[model samples]
Target: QNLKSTDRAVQQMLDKAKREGIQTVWDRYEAMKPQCGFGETGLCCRHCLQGPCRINPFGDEPKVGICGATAEVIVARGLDRSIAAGAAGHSGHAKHLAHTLKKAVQGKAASYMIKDRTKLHSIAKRLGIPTEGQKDEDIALEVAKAALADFHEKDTPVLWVTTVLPPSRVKVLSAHGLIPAGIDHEIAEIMHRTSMGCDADAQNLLLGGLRCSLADLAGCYMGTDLADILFGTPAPVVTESNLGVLKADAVNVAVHGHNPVLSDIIVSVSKEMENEARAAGATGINVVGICCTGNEVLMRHGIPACTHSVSQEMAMITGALDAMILDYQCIQPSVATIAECTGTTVITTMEMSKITGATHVNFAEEAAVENAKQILRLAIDTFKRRKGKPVEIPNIKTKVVAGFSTEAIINALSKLNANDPLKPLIDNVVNGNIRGVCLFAGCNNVKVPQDQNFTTIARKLLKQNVLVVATGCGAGALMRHGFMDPANVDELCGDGLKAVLTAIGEANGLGGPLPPVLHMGSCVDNSRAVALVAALANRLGVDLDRLPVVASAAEAMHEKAVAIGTWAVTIGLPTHIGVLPPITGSLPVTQILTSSVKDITGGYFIVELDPETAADKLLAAINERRAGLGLPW
Candidate 1:
């Protein structure tokens, strides 16, 4: 039962950890067996702390909190707080990028520049900022200021959400009062409403959550756009993944977080410091990614990802990693604990995300290159100390072709139909060559086998001709399973999807098909998926609810996933989650999410834990939408 992951490399690392008596996530999970039922079902409340109250799941005495809050109110408040926290996280990430852009434009950040001027002009035009007869720096400053202003409450709707989404979808969100005035405003509202003796209506609390989730979507959109302007929009890049990407004789530095502010510079500085690694008696410097930050650099620079999510410790367990540099989000503090045994130096760069037993290097965008160089030199020094140590690399890796930004996808499609880039895809759906589209996203949870739900559902959907795209650790999972390898198209995709992929690949001058699962980008790049769908919706003259598309975060674990999932539903797509969230204690909350909400938004949650059944339900959702669009299923 303690066997936690499906990846062979992770399994080998687990075996080694057990043999050496080292504690890992799986061991900790075992110790936490039969986890608290009250918390698991969202029945526990700590709101005012009159008492740490828990409503009995069964219809017994104490059916409400000491404050007389019922199960529905408790669950709804819990869910709202989760969405608020997630929105705060994504908005905070976007705000960081916004500040970086502002500083770069003002010439305060010397190491950063506007890498994609086209994107800058495009965004400025969208935001109604004039670019004519203006310097790029001026346009960038206004754009960054606009992005920052969207954080506070304003008279108008959030610019990113309104501009990025289709007019029809925006109208729908507005009709439901879901269009957020500002990202921070909505988050603060959720916190206020969910407080003790505040808004206790279950339905109203859920509505507040939906509004905050849209704020999350706006934050995510801004994050992706600002990142593209700063780092250059990603195109297709071939890379490798898993433990084998770690080299025994090289200074293996794993970047393990969500931000690219420091990691991107580290990638550039590592090239300049290669000879320095060689001077220390090493082959060269190998900078690999571990989480979304890894996803970020991998999309742009073809950096190999060592690992992700729950298996992050396995990278250090291989004994080849010299340093793990972290920024924020999904970084387990236990990696610092494991580093103590493996001699891998765990370095935290973000002031807000420091680990107790790790090295700290305060990173600022103004001196990004210097910060990155110092971090790399630390890794090289550690490499010198562990030069002759025996390392256990799993000899496991898979070829991955990732970085399919919405722009990149359009560029490829333009090769097929020059005048109307989306025509080929629209035609395929109309002609029944594409059944539907499904996006796999979110993180790996320790409870389920790592990558199990993702691979299982992806395999089923692919065989049925559901085009798959992935982001975040979900992409890490599928790429590790060879789903992103173009060569596996024949083995994985059905005849229809395979034919369409082959056509696109051939039209783009590749000898083979595109990978069965397209890697769009990191978690924030879920906005990219929305961008594609919104384009299709505009071209088809339909709202998003009528599209033959769906999304799933099969192994979701983060509060950010909760926010993303909510906004995905609000955008009118049937969403699936393999892990059950803690809302089951309230029948009204669960029913509203899984069924009643669809009538209003044309989207709902399909809460099936079984992967095969979940796949079936998602396919049914696609078919239903196709039928509504008068297309064959």
Candidate 2:
């Protein structure tokens, strides 16, 4: 919800805030700008029930005198706030589900259920939760609570056991004495300590925030269950993203959020409930998703996501949206005024979300079929209210395979691994063709004019014969510009990529995929690409660095993308990007982010001012590694 830029960029968003009237503290920036000094060092302390102090990092003096906090303590506290903010954002989704599960248990929660009994059964087996003789409902009722509790544990996040990290990595975490005992405990401890009283040490304070994040595992762990049942464990299937997915004739209701509880039912209800819209004289429901809500369903259902975190507003701005039905996340408060502008039914569902401008109603699953049908009906009827001509949808679109699950990618490329079939794919590139692959990924950012960054770099790379693989909002942007269409290789891509696509195109004849670029599924399936790369390594007999793989060349362009980029780097992928947040101010964070931490990873952070410079740098990086491997190409 927050985006920052330099002096000029700050002025621009200020103009938008005034024009849009978002209720941010920025509204009175002139008057309150001085008070923002508290945020300067990012150090603020609340401990021991006495005082909450903001430490002046620039001061040569010791640190906080109020609670005897030092600079080290101040820095830790700042880091904790970030940890808490990130955790709160992630665990907030889980907490919402727990609330629903409580309702479901009480027979009061609106529409939803546990999918993937198989995944649950597996979790139960690993954690020692009973599933064998117990009934599904019995197992579900108990498992939901157990799932909820994982976040609070003081020992280690429950998800750590199931997450795909190597044993050595897990051991390193354990060595740091950061095991979560339970999900609730972690969050509770953070809240307890971060209160205007308690822990003074900033490092300890940040650890509390980290503890709060233990709950994050619950959503993904729980989602594993939903995936098995609803979408049948997604294998690679082609899908699309962005406003281009919005249809003119269809009654469009973009379900937005991270939780699938509402969207999963909406998916079933859309097909079955389209008649409700059809009765309103519109063609059935055109239910799509926004944010992780798109990831929530499209990962399994092969349904296309309308957009991601940054695109939520743009999708509404499209004016074709019948109603933006939100479960949570990115449900802009501006949604309240959406009707005033576009008259879209800004419908909020489930618990904990009630938009000021939305026609807020409970998608309480206890109402079951009735609640979902009612929402769909509301959307269908609202479609009649479209006054002006249908808004012009950006015709830009890319054709891509969407449904690839971890299991499916394994199968699709099993042969490539078996016989080195992909050998032909990258073997001949010197520099202008297949020089490397950019795993362009992450959420959208309207603030940065991301379309310019994503499309410009993607087109440039393709024209140079490089491969692009996108995820989440990045994928959404490429699709909006029609970069995902493989057939465009000749026009936008260099000879190498065009030749590869041509070979695959001619060989497939009339059957399979096309293009130099590939669009993978929703965000979590970023895991799938990780696996794809790992699998490639296993088959290729070289480490990832030895492969022609790198992340985007200018990811410093977006904050969330930069975070995801860091997470990807943790997995050893090199990302080439510029420095943002003005390295001039904070030399430490910048150096660590840009270069200092290379010892732990085989990759390096490469900063380039222009696309040609970036493309050249990335190409050289790819070749330097390739030449070491003595691989053909």
Candidate 3:
């Protein structure tokens, strides 16, 4: 039962981990034994140095913290901090990408160039910048400058926050006073407000959290545009996934984590360095993906991903990974221990995050070629040492069709109706041919069975005629579990959804059904889904709250996933989670999040553990949204 996981590869590794006396995440979780109730309930407050305090949940021992902070205040404070952190992460990622674009436009970064000039011009035009006779570099720089200004601009809210969204939706935010004023400013304010005793009102603090969430949305939009411009905008691409992609006789290099800067260079230099692996007595070099960085190359380059968050260590446990290069975010430090155990070289690229025992190679855009080549060289050299090592690689993998960007989806839809691209989709929704759209996105939590919630809920939604899209590890979960295989269309999707997908795929010359699930880039690229939603809402002449679309972070584990859920609810989508968030300590706060907030934002949180029940709740929410729109149920 301990080894039981939805993924066969992960199960094999869990069993292997036990036999080898290696401590995996599950072991650490077991070692944790009985977890803390105060910390788990969000009642413990350590916002400042002023006495870390805990409030009694059951007994009337202490109703307040050392600072006299109420349970509500502590819970709100904890949630606000998470929102700020998540916003910082996403906005920081956007800021870095925008800066990289600035460097690329200035010809300082030789390893990078604007691959999507059309997207560049489109972005510039959207920002109201003149682009008629300007060079691509000029437009790209202007767009980059405009994006950079969003991080610090004070007078108005960030441009992307308003521009990417419809005016009516912006009005809704403005009316609620939730429109963020500067992405960084909102993040800073959140930090300032939640620091010690700045903001104590639960309602006010949560509103501030919503504002930060909007910044998160803005950051995601900017990051998507920047990545799309740097990396070519993704189109439908064929791919494969799972541990089987890791070759026994080839030098296998795994690119892990969220950032694409290092992974992109690695992909570029892999072809050039393939001969080096052959010289080392290996058949060839095999570069696979592990996380969102894996999603980055997987979507664009058709590279197969080995696993997601929970099973990331398991990927190294395969004993075939010559080297695993990680960028930043969501990478377990435990991976270094596994790497050492398996003789896999763990290479850390980002300067911001460094694991103690792993090799450190600072991957700057200027030295991208040098850093990547050196990393690959290390992998090649490492491969020579692993030749005689006995390894267990599961012969399990699946074919997938990924890279369903908003433009790609529109382009495919346009094949059916060039004049009105969204009409077919809109009409299908109205006619009940497609019941709704559900975005299954986020991280994996160890508390729940890995990939179990995602697979079960996704299958249930598809069986009920709902279209599913995924991002981050959610996409990785589906991809690794064979849910992204086009072959699953017939097995999973309902008659209505299957027919709609087949028609779309046939129109796009796919010669068969599209994949059951659409892989819409990394977690940061969720703005693509937002863009798709806003377009659909705009065409239907309704606010986003009226749309029959919802989002679920089934096994969400990170603070980033919390922020994403907050934004999902703020954007008027019923967001579901399989795990209980920390706010369960206070019924008032829980009510506000799970029920009352809906009255204000038209979105709410549904906490359900069972996949079938979660599917029913999501479907009911979709029906409610459709009913509010006066459309067919």
Candidate 1 segments exceeding 4 Å error: none
lDDT tens per residue, model 1, 220-309:
999999999999999999999999999998999999899898899999999998899899998899999999999999999999988989
Q: How much is 487 displaced in model 1, in angstroms?
A: 0.9
Cα error, candidate 2, residue 281 (Å): 2.4
Top-scoring candidate (lDDT): 1
**Global lDDT of model 1:** 0.93
Taken over the whole model, the C-alpha lDDT of each candidate is 0.93, 0.57, 0.89
TM-score for each predicted model, relative to the true structure = 0.99, 0.73, 0.98
- Window of ten residues with lowest summed lDDT in model 3: 1-10
Better of 2 and 3 by lDDT: 3
Residue-level lDDT for 52 in candidate 3: 82
Of candidates 3 and 2, the better by TM-score = 3
What is the per-residue lDDT of model 3 for residues 105-145, given as tens digits with 9 covering 90 to 100? 89899899999989988899889999999989998989999
- Tens digit of per-residue lDDT, candidate 2, span 6-112: 12222333344456554333333335546444444445555545555665557555355475655554554444444454445545555556556656655565355
